[PDB]
From a paper:
Like many other TRP channels, TRPC5 is permeable to Ca2+, with little selectivity among monovalent cations, and functions as a thermosensing channel. Here, we present structures of the human TRPC5-Gαi3 protein complexes using cryo-electron microscopy (cryo-EM) and demonstrate that Gαi3 can directly activate TRPC5, increasing its sensitivity to phosphatidylinositol 4,5-bisphosphate (PIP2) using electrophysiology. Remarkably, Gαi3 binds to the ankyrin repeat edge of TRPC5 ~ 50 Å away from the cell membrane. Electrophysiological analysis shows that Gαi3 increases the sensitivity of TRPC5 to phosphatidylinositol 4,5-bisphosphate (PIP2), thereby rendering TRPC5 more easily opened in the cell membrane, where the concentration of PIP2 is physiologically regulated.
Even after extensive 3D classifications and particle sorting according to the numbers of bound Gαi3 proteins, the four molecules of Gαi3 from the fully occupied TRPC5-Gαi3 complex (hereafter, TRPC5Class1-Gαi3) showed lower local resolution. Moreover, when we performed 3D variability analysis of fully occupied TRPC5-Gαi3, we observed substantial movement of Gαi3 proteins and cytosolic domains of TRPC5, showing structural heterogeneity. Therefore, to deal with this structural heterogeneity of the TRPC5Class1-Gαi3 complex, we performed focused 3D classification and sorted out approximately 30% of the TRPC5-Gαi3 particles with different conformations in the TRPC5 region (hereafter, TRPC5Class2-Gαi3) from TRPC5Class1-Gαi3. In contrast, we observed substantial structural changes in the cytosolic domains, including the CCD and the ARD, when TRPC5Class2-Gαi3 was superimposed with TRPC5Class1-Gαi3. First, when viewed at the bottom of the channel, the CCD was rotated by 45° in a counterclockwise direction in TRPC5Class1-Gαi3. This rotation was accompanied by the ordering and shortening of the loop between the CH and the CCD and the rotation of the connecting helix for 5°, thereby elongating the length of the CCD by a single helical turn and moving the CCD downward for 5 Å away from the membrane. Second, the ARD was also rotated by 8° in the same direction along with the CCD. Third, the ARD was stretched out from the symmetry axis by 4 Å, losing its interaction with the CCD. Fourth, we could newly observe a strong metal-like density surrounded by four His735 residues at the top of the CCD, which may have contributed to the stabilization of the rotated CCD. Finally, despite all the differences mentioned above, Gαi3 was bound to both conformations of TRPC5 with different relative locations; that is, Gαi3 in the TRPC5Class2-Gαi3 complex showed a slightly longer distance (~4 Å) from the membrane and was located closer to the symmetry axis.
Residue numbers in the entry:
A (entry chain D), D (entry chain B): 17 to 273, 286 to 665, 706 to 731, 739 to 761
B (entry chain A): 167 to 273, 286 to 332
C (entry chain A): 498 to 663
Write the structure that this text describes.
């Protein structure tokens, strides 16, 4: 058997106190009034007595929402400590009004002295009523608290190194973290933002960015900070969604401290705000500035207009140069024509790079330093225009914004490759005069290095077209999922690189004694790139290349065979190669497939919002006047606004509050309490 | 009072006789007794050390689920309930001194080692215990999370 | 476990390794059955190393020699056929026994169809399902592993490195 | 603009009728009583008047559960047609009692005549009250209906070809299908099975099997028949789960019309009934008959006992032959020892087949008809024992049950292969005397064919070990998922075979003119199995083999090259081969991966139940005394039960009814109706 006993002493309640608490629970007003009137004369019952569950008479009155029993218990001067917190958490407007309004009148002789009721508090001691009201998100209680001149402490910077923050973190880290989380939860409520901020959209944007940065910093409390940032973003999108006219939307978007607020939302990564349907409609109307009814048309006329405007690339840019104020020069300033002209210019550059690799132009390959062909002479202005455009993009916008795009790394690499190939071509022209045949050239010839860099730059230029997939409505979310899965591929390739380095080290350490010279082997070649596969594990670089090529099956099985009949070493190397093949083809690749599969399922729900955000970021890049000319031609030589914004935000806040007001065992207990209180009063009167 | 369950590897005469005579009644009685012992209210009321009692009951329920093939699911549910009760009791702390008193209590971090020995992943992975372990881990480097990554890598 | 990005990845790797072992039991059984059949069919046509070109005998030659002459060689040849490194002319004998060659080719084709169409895709499906279950709990167990690694260095036993602890 | 009008004429209700219906809706008893008393004298209001939503006064009384207004409307002789159906659907016990009990007394002068109320009925005209009560699943209403001598029509056989069923199907198929579905829904309720069947378990089993067969037959109504079968199976498992003692469980399982009811459940495919934990515990106790406390032991002693009992295979079977009544001979009759002895015998047969393929035994291969070696002489009794065991399994149990296992096809194939190889060996011994060398043998030599069949039989014997995976606790659900994915692989391989046949036909039709002889080609070989790959598309069989081998990449790219310089034909064939490769390696295989992935997710939730069902089917195969000896040794030459079952089913039905009783806007309308009726009565009295 096992004896059981109450380990921790809870004092038993007396018969009178238990009857009084039961009468308060059942809502019988007359019995509670009789007990309260008998309490002073006889001192029989401690009115501030607790229960087994930690509630007092006042808390039981608050939980049942009996305003009559609540005011009756208040009239006999019961203990009132922390009851306002329970009323605020219960979201009872009348209880909060009673507790606010009754604490002032009729206070005489301090309070009656009471001891040992104060240990048990459900609410934390750091909590204050305005902060808990902000956490509850109730509007009326927040309004009534804000009317009584109440303030909230200001949180410090995340990278704060002052004496008091460091001392509070060292003395009690848990209290500091709980206080900061409670303060940010109070500041992130939609009701407090609507009531105590003159700019709710900008305040919600800044609070969402700060909460996201705090979630990035604080590892322990990441989830609730992410939830707070999502709540602020959804509050901003819901406030934007309450508009009723196009003038209100253009007033909200164009308010400054042209579309300044949209740029501020994009800078703070508010994808829900940017991807709202009305803002998308306004951006579509601005995008198709000179082409009304673009969505109406059948696709053949749209494609014919696109072909006729893309084939007209060399005109309409010189027209802008010669007459910007003319009717023809003004058509290039629209964003759609700008994007189509840039796409046509890049397609022309790609087609010219295809045409440069033909035998019609390339002649007399046996020259050491060859002069540039006419195709290269014409391609050179496009490279210079790309260089001028990239340096102009570096200057305008700042160096701190140029690096956040992540497409500029390929542009920097392409420009470096073009500069390197141009320098190699000019040095080969200047000091490599001659006509030596190509079969006896140096391996480190700058002409060959220049051509290799030109080929790599041509590959980068052709792979630059992936960034235009946001313009279409079908290839955007595909590349968004591709971008997430590329990060997952990098996370896989770290472990793959570690395993490859380990197996390459083992194979090279086993096999590097049996290295043979190129003269002894057939055809005077040495490596895995021969007709007969030579020594593949003779060096660390050759071992790494051989282990890389074994994944695609291009490495044969006889590379592990040596000249001598060392059967044990050959068997050990074959076991090594087989273990590496089993790992890299049975565990790792299938695990990568499983990881990118799981990622896609998560990515798909959000795929549209981020696609619309990327398309909005691409659309507003062409809105400005900086960069009107193409790459081939870019190198050729006020308080009424604030008042209207306040009016629109006022109407939006009222509509959002109406919408949120329009949109459990505690509830039924109210109905039992209301029926029980009515039953006792009917029996008492009758 | 409540009867005490026997060991899982019990070979006494009465347990074997009860299993042979009526296995269903014995299994139902053992499951009802362990369900009664795994309630959070009874652990809070009738145990002087609720955390250690919850840890031992969770380990015993997990071992019983490993042994008893027919009744695996409710034993796993009872072990999860005990682990969640331990994590919820740890989560109710309000100060760093209470957390260090709870973690450092012995029969340095003895209770954390006892939780790791009993495989209480929810208790170890609580945010306040993780913050205390991070503070102890970066003992001589204050404000390690604050720094930009270049100075940390340097 | 020390990094914040490579911990749950190796936790999922640890679960999928157990799933890979559960797959590799059935794969080892199927491999042993097909290797037994192939060796029992082909071990009469074993040839010496002197008769074959270059004085080598096995699947590790320039020209692939008798791959089903012994049980060990048959096991190695059936293992290497999964990655495609075993050619198709290993099932050809010196004499013109077309029926035996066709039966051996059918045997090798059936083993290839099993081990490359049923088993590997089933392993992919199993480890995929496992990952979805693993991801929700991936953090808790990563934090548990990091806590176990952190308290290993808390004690004073083992302060010196491996070069200096002796 | 668009005009809108009431297209279909609903007659407007008068002021008095609308006020009367509103008073009945609000539950005011006095106003309704006054209107009813004034109705006869003045004829002002049609008491059977409808509303805009199709309810009458009586239906409004039934829906609000006002028994007083219900009886008051009954006392004035209102229309009562189909109101019992609304009461039964509302599951009101008092309303059903009132409608049953009031229809008999005080019927005078027929009914008062009423016209044109009868068109609108929510319940279908084929419905009857007992059938709708069975659909509702309420117990009290079903009991009250069954007490009044009520019957239900019997459904016909699914394969019924009588005149009346065919005539009803031809005249009105929809009415017949609805009537059959309503009848089977009425018969599948747990309450009706518990109340009107003396054997609820067997009745639930038969109804579940009939509903599953009807779902297999009727394509249109598959889902609700599957739901009814699942409901019957869950009712059977829930009734089995209510047991309280081992004696009740053994009485239920061992009841006959040893474990007869378990065999009946297995025959009807009741996986939930078999996989219940108490039945699994009883089967585990019977399975470990002679080994008490098997689950208790550490795994080393369990594996040591398994090794010592599996290595003792040649004893304990001859002991059963020589002394079945001895203490040693009785240990083989237990099921665990039987399974371990059979597994040891099959492992010994597999090890002997491995040992038969060694050079230690095989000698003198240059004999045309070779005598059988001593290994073959010893292997022959195992093949004869397998033949005798398979034919004994064909005889016992019936030919109709031998074919449903699906493992007997491999046993039939193995026996056919062993018979063919034995016949080929004996014919080669009898009439192929000589010692001709193997290099000049006929291609159709029976020795080579016998060895090929022996190798295929050895493969089948080694692959027979998959069936023992149910015994382990980890390899069972794996092979269950493998069994489902094998069916999905067959569904894939149909489309793959069609695509392979199409591309093979095209490739053979293109390439069969360029066939070359074996003499002209190097090494005197012709096919894809040469060192240099010969003509691969010369014949239909060769084209099929080449297209099969291209999936694994073993077919090179130079097979599409011809001797002459026909560049167009070579390019067309290369395009053909590339299109087949792109299909069979980019679309089909990945689609097969996706299909078997989806299937696994569905399979996993149910994987255990079916694994426990398969393990129970394997365990009871060894319970009987038929087949005690191994394959090497099998060829060596009462009404108290029904009363106890009725008692146990009685207690189980009572416990299940208590459990199901223990385990929306209509509800709140009751509370509004009860509050409104109390408010009117208090105002009327005061
Ligand atoms: C001697 C060696 C010779 C080698 C020769 C061959 C070299 C081949 C190189 C091939 C490179 C291919 C790169 C393909 C990138 C595809 C990216 C698709 C996804 C995508 O849109 O990514 C964007 C970023 O791209 C990026 O950040 C792309 C970065 C590309 C870097 C390339 C250089 C390294 C997202 O856009 P976003 O980052 O704005 O999205 C912010 C969202 N919140
Ligand atoms: C000249 C050509 C020479 C060719 C030489 C090589 C031949 C190689 C042949 C290889 C065959 C491999 C077969 C593997 C089968 C694995 C099955 C795993 C799943 C499984 O347990 O299936 C059981 C049925 O098996 C079955 O039904 C198995 C049927 C096997 C048929 C084999 C012959 C065709 C289920 O059991 P269950 O059906 O009772 O489950 C009832 C549930 N409700
Ligand atoms: C992180 C990555 C590692 C994770 C942990 C390990 C995972 C499993 C690794 C298995 C390695 C097997 C190596 C076998 C070997 O030596 O082969 C070459 C050698 C070549 O001689 O193989 C042999 O000598 C044995 C021939 C039979 C091999 C049977 C293999 C069964 C398992 C197959 C899995 C699928 C392929
Ligand atoms: C557990 C593992 C086993 C599960 C149960 C079985 C699964 C399916 C097994 C299919 C084996 C097919 C063997 C065919 C064969 O003999 O090929 C070699 C031989 C070589 O001569 O093929 C032939 O002789 C026939 C040529 C046409 C083959 C058509 C194959 C259709 C199915 C393809 C599936 C995907 C590949
Ligand atoms: C049901 C199965 C069919 C479903 C419907 C069709 C699916 C897509 C079929 C695509 C067939 C492409 C055939 C290309 C071809 O002729 O190649 C051989 C020939 C060989 O000369 O290829 C060519 O001549 C063109 C060389 C460029 C090929 C580009 C292919 C782009 C698509 C690649 C997909 C992934 C691989
Ligand atoms: C398929 C093979 C032949 C390679 C083709 C390479 C390029 C010629 C393709 C790749 C991406 C294509 C672009 C993808 C998306 C678009 C957006 C499309 O416009 C829209 O989607 C309308 C809405 C809008 O963008 O405002 C106009 C064509 C264009 C620029 C495409 C032009 C042709 C591009 C550059
Ligand atoms: C990518 C190729 C070149 C192979 C590299 C192999 C090694 C040089 C890598 C593999 C794993 C790496 C480790 C992975 C994780 C970490 C933890 C990292 O610290 C943290 O994550 C901070 C938090 C903490 O651990 O307390 C410091 C670097 C280190 C030891 C890394 C050091 C470099 C390692 C040993
Ligand atoms: C891994 C390689 C070497 C191939 C091995 C082939 C066989 C030797 C294996 C394959 C399946 C195995 C069987 C799988 C499962 C079981 C059940 C196992 O018993 C239980 O799981 C206990 C519960 C019960 O079955 O009652 C005893 C061993 C046995 C027969 C195994 C014996 C060894 C077998 C026949
Ligand atoms: Ca750029
Ligand atoms: Ca059989
Ligand atoms: Zn500070
Ligand atoms: Zn005991
Ligand atoms: Zn009929």
């Amino acid at each position: 058997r096992i004896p059981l006993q109450i380990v921790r002493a809870e004092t038993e309640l007396s018969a009178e106190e238990k009857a009084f608490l039961n009468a308060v629970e059942k809502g019988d007003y007359a019995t509670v009034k009789q007990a309260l009137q008998e309490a002073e004369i006889y001192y029989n019952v401690n009115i501030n007595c607790m229960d087994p569950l930690g509630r007092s008479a006042l808390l039981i009155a608050i939980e049942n929402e009996n305003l009559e029993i609540m005011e009756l218990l208040l009239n006999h001067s019961v203990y009132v400590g922390d009851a306002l917190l329970y009323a605020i958490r219960k979201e009872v407007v009348g209880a909060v009004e009673l507790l606010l309004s009754y604490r002032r009148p009729s206070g005489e002789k301090q309070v009656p002295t009471l001891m040992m009721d104060t240990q048990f508090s459900e609410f934390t001691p750091d909590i204050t009523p305005i902060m808990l009201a902000a956490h509850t998100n109730n509007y009326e209680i927040i309004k009534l608290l804000v009317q009584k001149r109440v303030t909230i402490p200001r949180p410090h910077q995340i990278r704060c190194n002052c004496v008091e923050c460091v001392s509070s973190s060292e003395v009690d880290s848990l209290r500091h973290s709980r206080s900061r989380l409670n303060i940010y939860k109070a500041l992130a409520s939609p009701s407090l933002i609507a009531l105590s901020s003159e700019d709710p959209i900008l305040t919600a944007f800044r609070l969402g960015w700060e909460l996201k940065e705090l979630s990035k910093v604080e590892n322990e409390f990441k989830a609730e900070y992410e939830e707070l940032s999502q709540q602020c973003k959804l509050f901003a999108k819901d406030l934007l969604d309450q508009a009723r006219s196009s003038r209100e939307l253009e007033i909200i978007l164009n308010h400054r401290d042209d579309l300044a607020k949209l740029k501020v939302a994009i800078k703070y990564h508010q994808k829900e705000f940017v991807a709202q349907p009305n803002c998308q409609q306004l951006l579509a109307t601005l995008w198709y500035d000179g082409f009304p009814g673009w969505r109406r048309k059948h696709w053949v006329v749209k494609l014919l207009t696109c072909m006729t405007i893309g084939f007209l690339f060399p005109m309409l840019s010189i027209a802008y140069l010669i007459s910007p104020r003319s009717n023809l020069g003004l058509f290039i300033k629209k964003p759609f024509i700008k994007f189509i002209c840039h796409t046509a210019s890049y397609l022309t550059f790609l087609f010219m790079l295809l045409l440069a690799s033909q035998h019609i132009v390339r002649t007399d390959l046996h020259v050491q330093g060859p002069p540039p062909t006419v195709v290269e002479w014409m391609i050179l202005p496009w490279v210079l225009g790309f260089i001028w455009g990239e340096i102009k993009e570096m200057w305008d916008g700042g160096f701190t914004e140029y690096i956040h795009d992540w497409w500029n790394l390929m542009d920097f690499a392409m420009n470096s490759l073009y500069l390197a190939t141009i320098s190699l071509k000019i040095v080969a022209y200047v000091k490599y005069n001659g006509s030596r045949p190509r079969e006896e050239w140096e391996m480190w010839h700058p002409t060959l290095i220049a051509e290799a860099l030109f080929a790599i730059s041509n590959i980068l230029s052709s792979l630059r077209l992936i960034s235009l997939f946001t313009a279409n409505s079908h290839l955007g979310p595909l590349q968004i999922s591709l971008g997430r899965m590329l990060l997952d591929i990098l996370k896989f390739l770290f472990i793959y690189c570690l395993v490859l380095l380990a197996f390459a080290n083992g194979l090279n350490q086993l096999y590097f004694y049996y290295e043979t010279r190129a003269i002894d082997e057939p055809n005077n070649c040495k490596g895995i790139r021969c007709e007969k596969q030579n020594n593949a594990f003779s060096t660390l670089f050759e071992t790494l290349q051989s282990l890389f090529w074994s994944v695609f099956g291009l490495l044969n099985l006889y590379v592990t065979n040596v000249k001598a009949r060392h059967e044990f070493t050959e068997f050990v190397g074959a076991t090594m190669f087989g273990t590496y093949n089993v790992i890299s083809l049975v565990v790792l690749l299938n695990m990568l497939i499983a990881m990118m599969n799981n990622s896609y399922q998560l990515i798909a729900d959000h795929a549209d919002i981020e696609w619309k955000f990327a398309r909005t970021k691409l659309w507003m890049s062409y809105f400005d006047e900086g960069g009107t000319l193409p790459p081939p031609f870019n190198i050729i030589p006020s308080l009424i606004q604030n008042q209207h914004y306040q009016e629109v935000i006022r109407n939006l806040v009222k509509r959002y509050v109406a919408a949120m007001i329009r949109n459990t065992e505690e509830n039924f207990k109210e109905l039992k309490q209301d029926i029980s209180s009515f039953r006792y009063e009917v029996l008492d009167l009758l």
